[PDB]
Amino acid sequence: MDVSFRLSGATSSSYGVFISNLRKALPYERKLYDIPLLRSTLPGSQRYALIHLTNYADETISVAIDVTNVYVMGYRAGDTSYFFNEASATEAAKYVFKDAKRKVTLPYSGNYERLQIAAGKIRENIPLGLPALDSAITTLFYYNANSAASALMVLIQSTSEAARYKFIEQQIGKRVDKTFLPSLAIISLENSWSALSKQIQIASTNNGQFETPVVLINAQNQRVTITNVDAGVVTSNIALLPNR
Numbered sequence: 538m539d540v541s542f543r544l545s546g547a548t549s550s551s552y553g554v555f556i557s558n559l560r561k562a563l564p565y566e567r568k569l570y571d572i573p574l575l576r577s578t579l580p581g582s583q584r585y586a587l588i589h590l591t592n593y594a595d596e597t598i599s600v601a602i603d604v605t606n607v608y609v610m611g612y613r614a615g616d617t618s619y620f621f622n623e624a625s626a627t628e629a630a631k632y633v634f635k636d637a638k639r640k641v642t643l644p645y646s647g648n649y650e651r652l653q654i655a656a657g658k659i660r661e662n663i664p665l666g667l668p669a670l671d672s673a674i675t676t677l678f679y680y681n682a683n684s685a686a687s688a689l690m691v692l693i694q695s696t697s698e699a700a701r702y703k704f705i706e707q708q709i710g711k712r713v714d715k716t717f718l719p720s721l722a723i724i725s726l727e728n729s730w731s732a733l734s735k736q737i738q739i740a741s742t743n744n745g746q747f748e749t750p751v752v753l754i755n756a757q758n759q760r761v762t763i764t765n766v767d768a769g770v771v772t773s774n775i776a777l778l779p780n781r
């Protein structure tokens with residue numbers, strides 16, 4: 538269940554090893570098109586995994602993930618736990634970080650629309666890359682509440698979204714000593730994970746064909762309609778599928 542990443546001495550390779558270990562920490566039913574399909578039901582003792590992240594200043598947070606969908610439920614810093622204001626995280630708080638002296642319910646839920654409203658900033662204007670992840674860890678470790686929502690969006694994209702997509706893992710891991718604003722291609726992948734996952738599952742009993750087309754933006758900023766499992770996003774990008 539545990540997976541660790543250290544920012545001190547991080548490389549593109551060490552980030553890749555971390556994201557592979559995160560994918561490998563999640564139990565799978567089987568593969569569809571060589572993509573792991575996550576479990577629909579687990580023993581409670583197996584339902585949540587912890588990611589330990591340590592920044593350049595040697596400050597560690599532990600992040601709780603739901604292994605059936607890679608959603609971040611909350612995090613711990615020292616003797617405080619912090620959970621999203623959402624029923625899924627209230628359930629998680631029964632299993633993880635129970636020994637923390639103080640449990641905080643964050644003001645907001647974990648979805649990007651509420652995170653962006655809380656931050657007063659959209660993902661397209663928040664730098665990613667390994668240095669951005671280092672700053673995000675600092676903010677969360679101290680719970681600097683005015684920067685926490687932005688930090689959580691860095692943290693989620695650098696963990697949950699990188700685990701879901703090779704293209705995101707690759708783009709974030711390439712920025713070792715710099716930052717970058719995420720392209721519409723990265724945003725589009727995050728926004729469409731749920732819909733694409735559903736259509737890949739449908740496709741497997743439907744001769745490879747989607748029931749419902751999915752619109753993405755590609756790396757040239759073009760709108761593309763996805764209708765089958767031969768799309769590059771299905772053959773050479775997406776890395777995990779949730780069960781409905």
Ligand code: NA
Nearest residue numbers: 656657683684
């Ligand atoms: Na803010």
